[PDB]
Amino acid sequence: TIPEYNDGLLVPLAPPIGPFLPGEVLLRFRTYMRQIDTADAAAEAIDCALPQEFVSWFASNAFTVQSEALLLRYRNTLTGQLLFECKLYNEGYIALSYSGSGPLTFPTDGIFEVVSWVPRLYQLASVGS
Amino acid sequence: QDLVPAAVEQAVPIQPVAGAALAAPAAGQINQIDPWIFQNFVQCPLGEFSISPRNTPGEILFDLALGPGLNPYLAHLSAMYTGWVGNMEVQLVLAGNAFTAGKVVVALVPPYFPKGSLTTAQITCFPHVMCDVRTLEPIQLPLLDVRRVLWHATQDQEESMRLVCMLYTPLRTNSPGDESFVVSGRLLSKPAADFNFVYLTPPIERTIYRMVDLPVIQPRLCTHARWPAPVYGLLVDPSLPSNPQWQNGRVHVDGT
Amino acid sequence: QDLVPAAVEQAVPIQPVAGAALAAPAAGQINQIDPWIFQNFVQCPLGEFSISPRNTPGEILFDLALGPGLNPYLAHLSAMYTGWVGNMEVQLVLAGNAFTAGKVVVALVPPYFPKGSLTTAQITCFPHVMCDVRTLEPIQLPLLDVRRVLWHATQDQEESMRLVCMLYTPLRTNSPGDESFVVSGRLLSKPAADFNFVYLTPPIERTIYRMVDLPVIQPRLCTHARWPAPVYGLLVDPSLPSNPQWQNGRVHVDGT
Amino acid sequence: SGQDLVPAAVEQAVPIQPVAGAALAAPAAGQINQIDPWIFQNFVQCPLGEFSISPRNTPGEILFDLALGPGLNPYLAHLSAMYTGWVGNMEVQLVLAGNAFTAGKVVVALVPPYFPKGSLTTAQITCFPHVMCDVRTLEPIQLPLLDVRRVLWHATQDQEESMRLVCMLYTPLRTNSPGDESFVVSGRLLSKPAADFNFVYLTPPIERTIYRMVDLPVIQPRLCTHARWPAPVYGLLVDPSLPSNPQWQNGRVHVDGT
Amino acid sequence: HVMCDVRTLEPIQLPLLDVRRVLWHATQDQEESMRLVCMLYTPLRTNSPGDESFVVSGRLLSKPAADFNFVYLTPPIERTIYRMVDLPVIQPRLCTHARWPAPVYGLLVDPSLPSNPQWQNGRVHVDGT
């Protein structure tokens, strides 16, 4: 959650991630930190909208926008099995159309390949778990 | 007599605009392009849309803009030149069943039209082409070059003749119909007979109009943007709150 | 005025290449073929493919190569000759319902294009023909003879103008739809007006380009390849491990 | 404007015949492909077109060596992502406009295709069609770069055996200057396509190719991180009082990615 | 471009054409017109006695061509935007200090003080801010 930037006051900061179309969830990245613990052994995870080397490659090349979102394609580079296609909005978060109920994980050995610019009202194929 | 015909085709009429006839004595050069770029419909970089049955009538499916950013050949040549003048020629395909009842209408909205919100009654007052989603052959349009200035610089803040496409009648299925059907659509375009660029510069990028390439980095060989640790997982949990307000790791796709 | 038409047909434009006009003073002979081989579309030996709904967009459905191996008449005549020069003319049919929404695009990839992996945005930059799977009449293409050399020998390691066909939009069914639907497709081809062979040799086989014939032996009158015993059974058990690493009985279909 | 230089060093005769460019490959390509007629008007600088002759160079040092292709122009190296194929010749200038106190000569030969590379000693670089020119020439030395080939065109994939253009340093560079300075003549190399250059067959413009010279990220070194320790960079500096040729293992990449 | 050598005698005339998108520019608006950019192509190779170090100076003189025209006669306005910054004709002894309400008693230099102060009074941009 947001910490205290002022000691007790308010401060301008980045707006929340959104909005999404009905039926789209936020694609999260995941690393595990060092938490001092007493008895819990579950690894505390911290999620970003985009990892590093995606905050470089932007502002090192400053692209245009030309629409509203990018149609990515996370094709697993081994044998070319298409895992999922996801929308990257211009505010810098990846939205993947999922209709399930629990956490579906993904293999971390594929290359994001761009396809095209889409409008905001684009509908993706769902994922299966 | 005189027979009238009820089925009479189609084909929106145009009056030809001037290309390099107006801009000739004010541009330093007028550069012709390859005469085989005028022959092939290639796909626009903004050439994807989808029509779901959860779209209401009046929804705008795409909004292009007449530029050299409607062609991968003309977005590559436009690094070398500083300005363009001329007309394109769009064409859209539609992958629909014979179970899908609906119709889209593709209008030619002029520049400096007040960009509020159009309705279905007002989209059909422009030069339009009516097309259903059941059709097989691709339908095409002229996308002319109505302009106040003599030529357009390739820094797109100047207004040009947009191409709006709305949903006229609702996309309803005669079958029971899954909501995950969506009718795909692609947009292909080519120059019409009067396209040319203006003034030879060195090729630079940056730009605009270069396509966004992503770094070829597998996410196991990456770094998290809120901790000095490599990335490990890749998940989507819908039980989490869907609007996080993080501060680190946020960026635009234009570098800001 | 000027009417434009939205529906305008089709028909990829070509510039005619030289056949036996370039290769005439460097070949010893120029042998004409039967003038009724130019009249009939006969099926290619690589003329089968299928589009399942489990195919993702971007998948390549076939990849031919312009040769005399695209015709059963020209793969029979090519035993007698040592080289060929000229253009073919493909045509593909598609057996689809009116329940299948999808589109394939058949491009003409030139020789010495870097054979990595194409995408959907790049397949439509070639001279292509867009065709859906719901169509009835067969659509055809010119398959020209872009080449660096004067003629092609009939030993296919020299590059020639391939013909790639991708899946543009995904093959989705408006119905609920069984996954075992697959849209069949066949490829038929004939010579265009400027085909001729080069130099008369004796007919030999071997080759290439003779079709693989199997021995007319019922498997009860055969011999097992890991024991000196005749074959008895013929089964398919999915409970066994599906990747055996045997050493006896393994062979290629090219003799190695 | 002194005329104690050599202004009589015009584009000399070379023992070569005229070579047909796009007239051969016109009926073997599948389409009509012309390029912009303002590309042929001005000499722009080659991408590998900058060299220098210090007086610490022996005779027989190869100054530049560049094959004929689309890589001799910033325009044609940009247009050759759209095409697969080229034909025809180029026209190359040479800006050797050194001081009025230097002395020395270079020799620019025309090495044919399928000539074995590697050594190319100074004794045998005169056996080709060559142009000899002083390093004090005022006007730019022009020379043609013909397209000798046995195939009807070349693919735009750089393994094509094509006509090179080697420039050996013939006699060493020296100055008769009255004190303490030895000038380094800094040459350039300008080029434009000839009247019948032509590309062959249109193709999707792929960036990840050949030529498509190296680009760098626009980020200050005070923002970048360090490749031998997890820390930022705190100022670059030279020092000739350190281990001069170290043998590190971290942060050592090639410029072909490996 | 023109690649002029640095030891030419006669001056290098060259045109500066008016490439434009509009029919005529407006004098009270700094709109984009054709620039001249001069780049040092090959470096200077000279001697120098011991001082000075032989700079090569270069000036740029201009005049209108045969088809320069103005458009529409208006009354002359004073502000402009083509005005040399005219300073007040006032000696510094009759001025007033910025920080403290006193007259000025002498202008000087001193290296030994903090060379880059951060005063918050007496700070004004030349453009009037």
CB distance A70 to A87 below 8 Å: yes
- What residues pair up with B169 in beta bridges, in sequence order? B103
Pairing of strands B139-143, B152-153: unpaired
Q: Write down the residue that tokens 């044609």 correspond to.
A: D76
User: With left for phi above 0 and alpha for psi between -120 and 50, is residue B86 left, alpha or beta?
Assistant: left
Contacting B residues, span 127-156, partner chain C, CB-CB under 8 Å: 129, 131, 136-142
CB contact (8 A) between residue E41 and residue D181:
no
Whether residue B83 and residue E21 make contact (CB cut-off 8 A), yes or no, is yes
Question: Residue C165: what residue type?
Answer: C
State the DSSP H helix or E strand holding residue C74, giving kind and residue range, or none if neither. Answer: helix C74-77
A109: annotated binding-site residue?
A: no
User: Is A35 a known ligand-binding residue?
Assistant: yes
First to last CA, chain B: 69
3-class secondary structure, B110: coil
Residues B231 and C120: their CA atoms lie apart, in Å, by 30
B186 and C CB contact within 8 Å: yes
The answer for B 63-92 residues in CB contact with C (under 8 A) is 72-73
Contact D30 C110 (CB under 8 A): yes
Q: How far is E73 from chain B (nearest CA, A)?
A: 24
Across the interface, which of D27, D151, D203 has its CB nearest the CB of C148? Answer: D151
CA distance A122 to C54: 21
3-state SS class at C76: helix
Q: Output the CA–CA distances (angstroms, integers) from residue E19 to B202, C26, C160, in the order listed.
A: 18, 54, 47
Sheet holding A104-105, edge to edge: A45-46, A28-32, B233-236, A104-105
C219, C231 in Cβ contact below 8 A?
yes
The coordinates were experimentally obtained by cryo-EM
Question: Domain D1-212 is in which class?
Answer: mainly beta
Structural contact between residues C132 and B95, judged by C-beta atoms closer than 8 angstroms: yes
Helices H, strands E: what count in chain B? Answer: 2, 12
Query: Using CB atoms, which chains have 3+ pairs under 8 A with B?
Result: A, C, D, E
By C-alpha distance, the chain B residue nearest A118 is B48
* Residue E18, min C-alpha distance to chain B (Å): 8
Distances (CA, A) of B117 to B10, B59, B89, B121, B128: 27, 10, 25, 12, 17
Two tokens, residue C130: 């867009």
Nearest-angstrom CA–CA distance, B72 and B86: 16
Query: SS3 sequence, chain A?
Result: CCCCCCCCCCCCCCCCCCCCCCCCEECEEEEECCCCCCCCCCCCEECCCCCECCCCCCCCCCCCCCCCEEEEEEECCCCCCEEECCEEECCCCEEECCCCCCCEECCCCCEEEEEEEECCCCCCCCCCC
Distance (Å, whole) CA D108 – CA C210: 54
Closest CA to B180 of B53, B90, B86, B89: B53
- Which pair of tokens denotes residue B240? 């989490």
Phi, psi for residue C122 in degrees, rounded to 5: -95, -20
Q: Does A44 belong to an annotated binding site?
A: yes
- CATH tag, A1-129: 2.40.510.10
Contact (Cβ atoms closer than 8 angstroms) between residue A76 and residue A3: no
The answer for residues whose C-beta is within 8 angstroms of residue C31's C-beta and 6 or more apart is C81, C196, C197, C198, C199, C200
Tokens 């979102």 locate to: A69
The answer to whether the beta carbons of residues B231 and A108 sit under 8 Å apart is yes
Angstrom resolution of this structure: 3.1
Which of B97, B130, B134, B187 to mutate: most C Cβ within 10 Å? B97
Residues of B in contact with C172 (CB under 8 A): 181
Q: Is there contact between B and E if contact means ≥3 C-beta pairs under 8 Å? A: yes
CB-CB under 8 Å, D36 with B200: yes
Of B39, B99, B129, the CB nearest to C174: B99
In whole angstroms, what separates CA A53 from the centre of its chain? 14
Integer Cα distance of D257 and B217 in angstroms: 13
Nearest CA to B123 out of B45, B194, B57, B174 is that of B57
Rounded to the nearest angstrom, the minimum Cα separation between E67 and chain D is 26
Specify the DSSP class assigned to residue B13.
B
D207 CB neighbours in chain B (<8 A) are 210, 213
* Gap between the Cα atoms of A49 and D72, Å rounded: 44
Task: Please report the beta strands in chain B, taking only residues with DSSP state E, as ranges in sequence order.
Answer: 42-51, 60-65, 83-85, 88-95, 100-107, 128-132, 139-143, 152-153, 162-173, 183-191, 196-197, 233-236
Which chains lie within 8 Å of chain E at 3 or more CB pairs, if any? B, D
Task: Measure in Å the smallest separation between the Cα of A42 and chain B Cα atoms.
Answer: 14
| CA–CA dist D38, B28 (Å, integer) | 11
Interchain contact, D2 vs E5, CB within 8 Å: no
Rounded to whole angstroms, how far apart are CA atoms A98 and A85? 11
d(CA A31, CA D124) in angstroms, rounded, equals 64
Of A2, A105, A121, nearest to B61 by CB-CB distance is A121
Task: Please check whether residue E92 is in contact with residue E107, taking contact to mean a CB–CB distance below 8 angstroms.
Answer: yes
Do residues A16 and B243 lie in contact, with contact meaning Cβ atoms separated by under 8 Å? yes
Quote the CA–CA distance of A40 and A43 in Å, as a whole number.
8
- CA–CA distance, A19 with C205 (Å, rounded to integer): 67
Chains that touch D (3 or more CB pairs under 8 A): A, B, C, E
Taking CA atoms, D98 is separated from B168, D57, D176, D184, in Å, by: 73, 16, 13, 8
Which helix (H) or strand (E) covers residue B74, if one does?
A: helix B74-77
3-state secondary structure of E118: coil
- Nearest partner of C196 among C17, C50, C74, C100, judged by Cα: C74
Q: Which CATH class is domain B1-210?
A: mainly beta
CB contact at 8 A, C189 and C88: yes
Closest CA in chain B for residue D73: B202
A7 is in an annotated binding site: no
Cis peptide, bond prior to residue B205, ω within 30 of zero? no
For B102, the token pair is: 């609906």
| Residue pair D137/D6 in contact by the 8 Å Cβ criterion | yes
Among A54, A88, A91, A129, the residue to mutate for chain B (most B Cβ within 10 A)? A54
Peptide bond into C142 cis (omega under 30): no
Residues of A in contact with C56 (CB under 8 A): 82
| Buried residues in C135-171 as b, exposed as e (16+ CB within 10 A) | eeeebbbbbbbbbbbbbbebeeeebbbbbbbbbbbbb
Which chains pack against C, by 3+ Cβ pairs within 8 A? Answer: A, B, D
CB atoms within 10 A of CB D130: 21
Measure the CA–CA gap between B129 and B51, rounded to whole angstroms.
17
